[PDB]
Amino acid sequence: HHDITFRNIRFRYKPDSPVILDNINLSIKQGEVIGIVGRSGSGKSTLTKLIQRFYIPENGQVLIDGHDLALADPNWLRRQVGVVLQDNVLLNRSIIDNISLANPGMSVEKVIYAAKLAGAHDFISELREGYNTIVGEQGAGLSGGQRQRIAIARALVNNPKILIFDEATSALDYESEHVIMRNMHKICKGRTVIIIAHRLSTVKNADRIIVMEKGKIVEQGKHKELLSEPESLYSYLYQLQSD
Ligand SMILES: Nc1ncnc2c1ncn2[C@@H]1O[C@H](COP(=O)(O)OP(=O)(O)O)[C@@H](O)[C@H]1O
């Protein structure tokens, strides 16, 4: 079963604007963990915007869990997709409010479960005010890596069938990265996962990597297979990021 399908997708942001995605064809199986890589502005984030129907393509179809998004319930779609946002933790609000910022009338139990998957529960639990701690500066002083785990918990809380990781915009402390990587298999378990990767190393072990260049998928496959294509863009990007 394919959880996400793009067929012949063409997209530009505005009527006059340049084509950003051109004839994208992609089929992602349920439970697959996919990495998306490529230079800045290749169209990686735009692809995920279309999955959420934030924009509508001028040609082609996006199908989510078999449903053409043209016809699909927008509320259902909102519930099927969880996005791990960058720099989106509200400082003026509690940790629990930040995690449940979609279904406010939801379980403390559901919040805790998501924070445990995210590897946040342990550090939250050792806070004077626990989950009621206000995130903000002089109000808690949570690190960027702590805030990122809260962001993961927020994405997981409603148990989405599809999980998307937006491209990393900063660097995380060793402890935060370590905890997340140790927990990735639990976070991704039972879900279709798309990771937009800043460093190719992040997604070395994804089921498949998709390589974008100038709005096109140019290459796709497992890491070892992409490195086997003699003049691949993947190999060049791999070389560039190497020590
Ligand atoms: N909201 C927007 N309006 C107009 N152009 C945009 C918008 N968002 C992104 N773009 C443009 O789309 C192209 C691809 O962007 P993006 O999908 O974010 O690439 P990536 O995620 O690979 O860096 C870039 O030229 C970028 O400036």
Curated annotation (Swiss-Prot):
Q: Which residues bind ATP?
A: 38-45
Where in or outside the cell it occurs: the entry states: Cell inner membrane
Q: Where is the ABC transporter domain?
A: 4-239
What's its job?
Answer: Part of the ABC transporter complex HlyBD involved in hemolysin export. Transmembrane domains (TMD) form a pore in the inner membrane and the ATP-binding domain (NBD) is responsible for energy generation.
- Summary of subunit composition and partner proteins: Homodimer.
**Homology family:** Belongs to the ABC transporter superfamily. Protein-1 exporter (TC 3.A.1.109) family.
What is stated about domains? Answer: In HlyB the peptidase C39 domain, the ATP-binding domain (NBD) and the transmembrane domain (TMD) are fused.
The note filed under miscellaneous reads:
The complex HlyBD-TolC (OMF) forms a single transport channel across the two membranes, allowing direct export of alpha-hemolysin. This channel is involved in type 1 secretion system.
This one is known as: Alpha-hemolysin translocation ATP-binding protein HlyB
Instruction: Give the gene name.
Output: hlyB
